[PDB]
RNA sequence: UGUACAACGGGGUAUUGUAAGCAGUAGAGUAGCCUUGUUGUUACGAUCUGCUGAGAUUAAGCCUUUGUUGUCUGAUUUGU
RNA sequence: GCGUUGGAUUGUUCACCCACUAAUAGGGAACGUGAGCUGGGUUUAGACCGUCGUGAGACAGGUUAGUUUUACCCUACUGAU
RNA sequence: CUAUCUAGCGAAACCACAGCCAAGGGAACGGGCUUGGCAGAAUCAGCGGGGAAAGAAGACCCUGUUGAGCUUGACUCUAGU
RNA sequence: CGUGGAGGUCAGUGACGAAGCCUAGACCGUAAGGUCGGGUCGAACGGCCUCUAGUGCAGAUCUUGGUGGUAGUAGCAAAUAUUCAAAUGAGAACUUUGAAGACUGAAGUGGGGAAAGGUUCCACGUCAACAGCAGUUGGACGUGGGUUAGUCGAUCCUAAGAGAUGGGGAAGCUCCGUUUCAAAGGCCUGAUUUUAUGCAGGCCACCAUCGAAAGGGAAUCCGGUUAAGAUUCCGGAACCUGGAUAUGGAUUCUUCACGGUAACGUAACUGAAUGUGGAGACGUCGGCGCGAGCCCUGGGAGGAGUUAUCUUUUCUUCUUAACAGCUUAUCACCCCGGAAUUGGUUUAUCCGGAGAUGGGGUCUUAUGGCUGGAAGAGGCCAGCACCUUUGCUGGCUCCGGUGCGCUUGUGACGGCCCGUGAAAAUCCACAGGAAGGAAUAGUUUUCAUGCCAGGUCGUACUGAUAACCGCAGCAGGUCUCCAAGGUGAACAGCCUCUAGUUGAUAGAAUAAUGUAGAUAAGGGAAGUCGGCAAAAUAGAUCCGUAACUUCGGGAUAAGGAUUGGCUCUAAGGGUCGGGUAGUGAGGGCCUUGGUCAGACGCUUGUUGUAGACGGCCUUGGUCUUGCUACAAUUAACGAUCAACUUAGAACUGGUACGGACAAGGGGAAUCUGACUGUCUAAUUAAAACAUAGCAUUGCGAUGGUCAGAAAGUGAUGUUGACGCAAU
RNA sequence: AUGGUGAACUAUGCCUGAAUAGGGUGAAGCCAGAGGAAACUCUGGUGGAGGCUCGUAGCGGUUCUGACGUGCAAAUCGAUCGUCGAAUUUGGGUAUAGGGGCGAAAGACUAAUCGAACCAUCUAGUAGCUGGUUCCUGCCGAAGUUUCCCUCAGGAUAGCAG
RNA sequence: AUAUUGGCGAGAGACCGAUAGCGAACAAGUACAGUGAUGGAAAGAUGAAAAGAACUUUGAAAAGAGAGUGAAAAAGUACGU
């Protein structure tokens, strides 16, 4: 049975794309009978079409990696590919230096 | 072209009506020499040019 | 590229349907149909083109008035109604 | 139906370069604390050492093998 | 019968030198060999300089930049049934 | 990855007829003419000598009482002044 | 000899069978050809005497059509990709589903559109044809369905420009101009009560029309719903325009308002012709401030993942619209005050007696905050059972933090010019004072509320290595908005999350020769016309840098030293606090009593529950202070917070450290064009053209240069010698 | 030659909008400091200019004279390239047209065509120049020579022949 | 009294017979190509009458073999010869 239409319809009613809709083949006999959104909608609540929860993109290395940089690691000459102004412009360092001098004198 | 004009659409509506094969009764008419729709138009092989 | 790569840069329309003959010869910028002429008060037909004239002379349409003119003169332009002869 | 053959496994040869895991008063040191020290330990700590001159691979065109399992008659054609 | 080279200059045929070596002999095969290669030169079109012409233009003149295509046939040859 | 073999699909270029050589003459460097050499099916993958191979009734030279572009104290006119 | 037709003739042949075609069967003629036999086949044809002509075939790179060998050959090899099982089906490397493995890596192989296409959109059934393999699959075939607008656009305005009148040319098709040698129009008050709308005056003069669905433009969003529609449909909630009528409020015998010194405010708070002003209306670049979306992240409330060992662990939901009330900023302005001992002040030095700093206020309301819309909406979860049509009960949907972060918007600025960087429709306001008006009520419909209507046209889909154009489903071309995580300067390369594909013939060995990547011991350009192709350095930090010059450059010149990991050191900020004793509020006043809104909530009453434990007063132990005192100050301190940047020190690694990607060969000169730039789109990118500079020439408009067939025509010219035109 | 069509490609102008990561260098102007008697000169910060520069998106294309060259392609693909906030790139509207437009010129572009467009008619244009020129048999059967011609890849005259 | 390939209505031929005759004997100025002015074809004859194939069998079907119709399907719609 051609189930392309049902996969399309199941994507829209649930909301997720076609890569997260699961239409089992063991009971595919009645899946092709669903030719409407209401028919597909009741196929979701009973448990026929699971949501195929999102693939993990765990940023656990990055949190540890950024933790290392915050400690003072990976801050050598071989870890840099741009000039000292691309990384931190001297204008910002000067602006950060004036605005604290201006307010300190004002304070 | 999405944002069309009625003059263009009235021509396309004419094309849709004439985009059909012969009804079978035609071939059974007395002294009939017609066997195919020589005016068939499709959107791939030929263009209407409006 | 003067060939195939330059044939994909054409998506505009120079001519459009002529409101008088519907042959898509109505130049947009020039506002003059190139087949009959519009909104000129005369249909262009040159003697150096004879096939083109033969395509638009009397007989290529319906003759909504002249198919009856020969018949109307065929009797003498009578008016009124008809009589009852027999049967 | 043969100290036949084949697939695995074993041994040898070789490439490689010393693993997984545990342990270590090894470790530049960093700080908490408590009986506050004449190694105080807890947590982290690139790395190092001990089993590991190991581990992995080793035939696809390396060698040998009594071990385990398995195979041994399908089709076609041929004469003075 | 066998062997007759490596380089500087030049597109170079040619030629002149450096050097080795036994020796650096001459040549033909559609001035062998571009559906083997290169395009350095001469040879379309761009452009510069000199002479000539009133001019458009001309010069074995000098210089720079200038797409080079196909064998899936037969024979011949190289291997195989 | 192709080329190779296999399952499916499946053209074109080109074609007087075809395709082994030496020598001779010949329109004076033909596969077929002559004289000799030789010659045994069916073929397969490469190859590039050849078929003066293919692509276009040579863009070079000349003829034509054939043109075109350009130039000028060529001839004859001419819009403008 | 033969071919198409015509006159005559043979009363010629013929469906028990003409013509035509086939026939290594026969006969006649040297030959052109003629006759017969057989097979095929079904409607006309032949001999002879003459006439007539579109009358004969091998080729003219002859016209049209068809078929060959080549040949079952060339080939169906770019875009890093496929595999297993089941289902359907006579028929699965390709259809569907499930399970893996990958890719595009968010300047998509993702979401929407402009032009273009025109039903390709969706459903059913189906494979003769197309999808250069196949196919029960399709952008294919047959039949049907689908596009809902007062707010989105077209509609309207005008730009560059087109063009109709009046006119002038032209034999003329038509050409010039379009406000110019045109007496070119409607319009409010009054008349009213045959005036229907004429008429008597005040009047203004613009002066066809078209022309930009990314130029200006009146007004709306959210939730949900189809097989295919939506800012259009359902529900809820808005605003604008045209019109009619009242209700409510303000105004008034100071008849057409008050307050504030003022900037100005208060929902309303008369008003014509005419004139004026504002908006529409607007260059580019650079930095800074602020806002939104996204990114990062803490607490808590749930779900999913791992769990040989460890991880208060990983991922995921926690959201709020158009519209409305209150409130909120730079800039700017106003009142007092008066300045040198000059002071405020931006990252970027402008401002101040034409009046600062300071104190106090006004204003635009982008934006933002609370509330209504609106939590009854959406989202994440637990139980109920319904072959079903489906729902009910339910919980949460919360409190934060930082930043040179990316996209974008906006504000005050600064730089640039022999470029200073659009028009109109439309809307509003001011000066003016015409006209009318009081309270026995007349206005007020640019105050609040109420009533009605918003016509026509488009809305489906693609928008691209299959929907557009390139004869095709052809590696080509085609305008634009959104765009995450990590390394990294980075929208660079590389890997991944959301989303989407897994698609472009396949199977086996995998010969040469190839195309695309590569590696080579020693020498090294000896090769070649020419180091052409490859190669080397190539990121970042520190040191160092010549000849010459137009002094700006050459110059990251040339040439040297480091780069990983762990543990540390130092430096670079924000926000709060400058006392003790009596006193007043401890405007939290919790606490003990209740007084009585102490009530809902857990159909009158039974009598049962809390009073929301809260307005209202306390005898109170209940970390901000005005007064005095010690003497109040220095040293400056103490508490919280979250960023990266830079430098340095030890240790450590078979001395490896821009470890993958990423990424300058350099120098002495010579010829020539000054440089940036441009051209032979399909063989020449150049010393060629162009450019600034220099010089010359013509021209004072009854003109200089140029156009037209004329013109009452034009381009320079919306111009003037520092200009135009020709070099 | 006559009469018509074409700037949807490209050539130029105008009107209207749209697009251009990240670094290097460092000008005025300004501030502070130092020197000196003055004139004024040096040091350290900002500052962002600059038809500058390295380099993506984009526009062209230099070289390999690579690939292909009966191709994916009537000129494309890969690497190596010049430039990249401006005499930048481009959409839409508009204007300029055939011996005429437009040209930072190359006789370049003018919708695969241009030192001179496309279409139709005159037109079956003319050619001393190539090619072809369609059945049998019988009989006879030559010439490349004279003269003239802007004549010598041609005619006329005479000749040969029926 | 003269001309008249246009329009209507007719009569004819030593004309052509559908690669000829008008481009078109046919859904012909039609399909189609070009942005455009314009260019522009191919296509007649199953049989007297569809009587154009009931039904059997094989195959998934398309179809085949029979049967049958029809003088004749060596007339079965891709149909005179």
Curated annotation (Swiss-Prot), chain A:
| Entry GO terms, CC | cytosol; cytosolic large ribosomal subunit
Taxonomically, the superkingdom here is Eukaryota
Q: Which GO terms describe its biological process?
A: cytoplasmic translation
Q: Which residues carry this modification: Phosphoserine?
A: 29, 36, 90
Q: Taking the first listed entry, what is the main subcellular location of this protein, grouped into a coarse class?
A: cytoplasm
**Does the keyword section mention Cytoplasm?**
yes
Compartments it resides in: Cytoplasm
Q: For the region Disordered, give the residue spans.
A: 57-84
Q: Which GO terms describe its molecular function?
A: RNA binding; structural constituent of ribosome
Basic residues bias: start-end ranges:
58-67
Q: Name the keywords, alphabetized.
A: Cytoplasm, Isopeptide bond, Phosphoprotein, Ribonucleoprotein, Ribosomal protein, Ubl conjugation
Please tell me whether the keyword ATP-binding is annotated for this protein: no
Glycyl lysine isopeptide (Lys-Gly) (interchain with G-Cter in ubiquitin) crosslink residues: 20, 52, 59
User: Main role?
Assistant: Component of the ribosome, a large ribonucleoprotein complex responsible for the synthesis of proteins in the cell. The small ribosomal subunit (SSU) binds messenger RNAs (mRNAs) and translates the encoded message by selecting cognate aminoacyl-transfer RNA (tRNA) molecules. The large subunit (LSU) contains the ribosomal catalytic site termed the peptidyl transferase center (PTC), which catalyzes the formation of peptide bonds, thereby polymerizing the amino acids delivered by tRNAs into a polypeptide chain.
**Description of how the protein assembles with itself and partners:** Component of the large ribosomal subunit (LSU). Mature yeast ribosomes consist of a small (40S) and a large (60S) subunit. The 40S small subunit contains 1 molecule of ribosomal RNA (18S rRNA) and 33 different proteins (encoded by 57 genes). The large 60S subunit contains 3 rRNA molecules (25S, 5.8S and 5S rRNA) and 46 different proteins (encoded by 81 genes). eL19 lies in close proximity to the binding site for eukaryotic initiation factor eIF4G.
Other observations noted: Present with 97700 molecules/cell in log phase SD medium. There are 2 genes for eL19 in yeast.
Family affiliation:
Belongs to the eukaryotic ribosomal protein eL19 family.
Q: How is this protein named in the record? A: Large ribosomal subunit protein eL19A
Q: Which gene encodes it?
A: RPL19A
- Residue span relative to the full protein: 2 to 108 of 189
Curated annotation (Swiss-Prot), chain B:
- Keywords (A to Z) from UniProt: Cytoplasm, Ribonucleoprotein, Ribosomal protein
Check the record and name the Pfam families matching this protein. Answer: Ribosomal_L39
Q: Give the region (Disordered) as residue ranges.
A: 1-21
Q: Choose any GO biological process term that the UniProt entry carries and state it.
A: cytoplasmic translation
Q: Which Gene3D superfamilies has this protein been placed in?
A: Ribosomal protein L39e
Q: Indicate the principal place this protein occupies in or around the cell.
A: cytoplasm
**Start-end of Basic residues biased regions:** 6-19
| Any one annotated GO CC term | cytosolic large ribosomal subunit
Subcellular location as annotated: Cytoplasm
One of the entry's Gene Ontology molecular-function terms is: structural constituent of ribosome
Q: Say which domain of life the source belongs to.
A: Eukaryota
Entry function: Component of the ribosome, a large ribonucleoprotein complex responsible for the synthesis of proteins in the cell. The small ribosomal subunit (SSU) binds messenger RNAs (mRNAs) and translates the encoded message by selecting cognate aminoacyl-transfer RNA (tRNA) molecules. The large subunit (LSU) contains the ribosomal catalytic site termed the peptidyl transferase center (PTC), which catalyzes the formation of peptide bonds, thereby polymerizing the amino acids delivered by tRNAs into a polypeptide chain.
PANTHER family assigned to the protein according to its UniProt record, in alphabetical order:
LARGE RIBOSOMAL SUBUNIT PROTEIN EL39, RIBOSOMAL PROTEIN L39E
Q: Report the family membership.
A: Belongs to the eukaryotic ribosomal protein eL39 family.
Q: What is the protein's quaternary organization? A: Component of the large ribosomal subunit (LSU). Mature yeast ribosomes consist of a small (40S) and a large (60S) subunit. The 40S small subunit contains 1 molecule of ribosomal RNA (18S rRNA) and 33 different proteins (encoded by 57 genes). The large 60S subunit contains 3 rRNA molecules (25S, 5.8S and 5S rRNA) and 46 different proteins (encoded by 81 genes). eL39 interacts with YIH1.
Q: What is this protein called?
A: Large ribosomal subunit protein eL39
Q: Which organism is it from?
A: Saccharomyces cerevisiae (strain ATCC 204508 / S288c) (Baker's yeast)
Curated annotation (Swiss-Prot), chain C:
Keyword Ribonucleoprotein listed? The answer is yes
Keyword check for Cytoplasm:
yes
**Residues bound to Zn(2+):** 18, 21, 33, 36
Q: Quote the function comment for this protein.
A: Component of the ribosome, a large ribonucleoprotein complex responsible for the synthesis of proteins in the cell. The small ribosomal subunit (SSU) binds messenger RNAs (mRNAs) and translates the encoded message by selecting cognate aminoacyl-transfer RNA (tRNA) molecules. The large subunit (LSU) contains the ribosomal catalytic site termed the peptidyl transferase center (PTC), which catalyzes the formation of peptide bonds, thereby polymerizing the amino acids delivered by tRNAs into a polypeptide chain.
Q: Could you state one GO biological process linked to this protein?
A: cleavage in ITS2 between 5.8S rRNA and LSU-rRNA of tricistronic rRNA transcript (SSU-rRNA, 5.8S rRNA, LSU-rRNA)
Subcellular location(s) per record: Cytoplasm
Q: Please provide one cellular component term from the Gene Ontology annotations of this protein.
A: preribosome, large subunit precursor
Return any one Pfam family short name. Answer: Ribosomal_L37e
Q: How is the cofactor bound?
A: Binds 1 zinc ion per subunit.
Full protein name: Large ribosomal subunit protein eL37A
Which NCBIfam families does this UniProt record tie to the protein?
PRK04179.1
* Gene symbol of the encoding locus: RPL37A
Could you say which cofactors this protein requires? Zn(2+)
What is the protein's major site of localization?
cytoplasm
Which molecular function GO terms apply here?
Answer: RNA binding; rRNA binding; structural constituent of ribosome; zinc ion binding
- Zinc finger spans (C4-type) are 18-36
Question: What more does the entry say?
Answer: Present with 21800 molecules/cell in log phase SD medium.
Top-rank taxon, per record: Eukaryota
Q: Which PROSITE patterns match?
A: RIBOSOMAL_L37E
The entry's keywords = Cytoplasm, Metal-binding, Ribonucleoprotein, Ribosomal protein, RNA-binding, rRNA-binding, Zinc, Zinc-finger
Its quaternary organisation is:
Component of the large ribosomal subunit (LSU). Mature yeast ribosomes consist of a small (40S) and a large (60S) subunit. The 40S small subunit contains 1 molecule of ribosomal RNA (18S rRNA) and 33 different proteins (encoded by 57 genes). The large 60S subunit contains 3 rRNA molecules (25S, 5.8S and 5S rRNA) and 46 different proteins (encoded by 81 genes).
Tell me which family the UniProt entry assigns to this protein.
Answer: Belongs to the eukaryotic ribosomal protein eL37 family.
């Amino acid at each position: 049975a051609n189930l392309r239409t049902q996969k399309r319809l199941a994507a829209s009613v649930v909301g997720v794309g076609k890569r997260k809709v699961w239409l089992d083949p063991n009971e595919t006999s009645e899946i092709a009978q669903a030719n409407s959104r209401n028919a597909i909608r009741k196929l979701v609540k009973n448990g026929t079409i699971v949501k195929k929860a999102v693939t993990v993109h765990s940023k656990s290395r990055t949190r540890a990696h950024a933790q290392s940089k915050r400690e003072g690691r990976h801050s050598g000459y071989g870890k840099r590919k741009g000039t000292r102004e691309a990384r931190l412009p001297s204008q910002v360092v000067w602006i950060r230096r004036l605005r604290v001098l201006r307010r300190l004198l004002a304070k | 072209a999405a944002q069309k004009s009625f003059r263009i659409k009235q021509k396309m509506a004419k094309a849709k009506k004439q985009n059909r094969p012969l009804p079978q009764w035609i071939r059974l008419r007395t002294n009939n020499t017609i066997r195919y729709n020589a005016k068939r138009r499709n959107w791939r092989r030929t263009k209407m040019n409006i | 590229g003067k060939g195939t790569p330059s044939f994909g840069k054409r998506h505009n329309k120079s001519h459009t349907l002529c409101n008088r003959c519907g042959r898509r010869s109505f130049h947009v910028q020039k506002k003059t149909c190139s087949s009959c002429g519009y909104p000129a008060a005369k249909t262009r037909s040159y003697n150096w083109g004879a096939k083109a004239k033969r395509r638009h002379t009397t007989g290529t349409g319906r003759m909504r008035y002249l198919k009856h003119v020969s018949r109307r003169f065929k009797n003498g332009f009578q008016t009124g109604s008809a009589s009852k002869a027999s049967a």
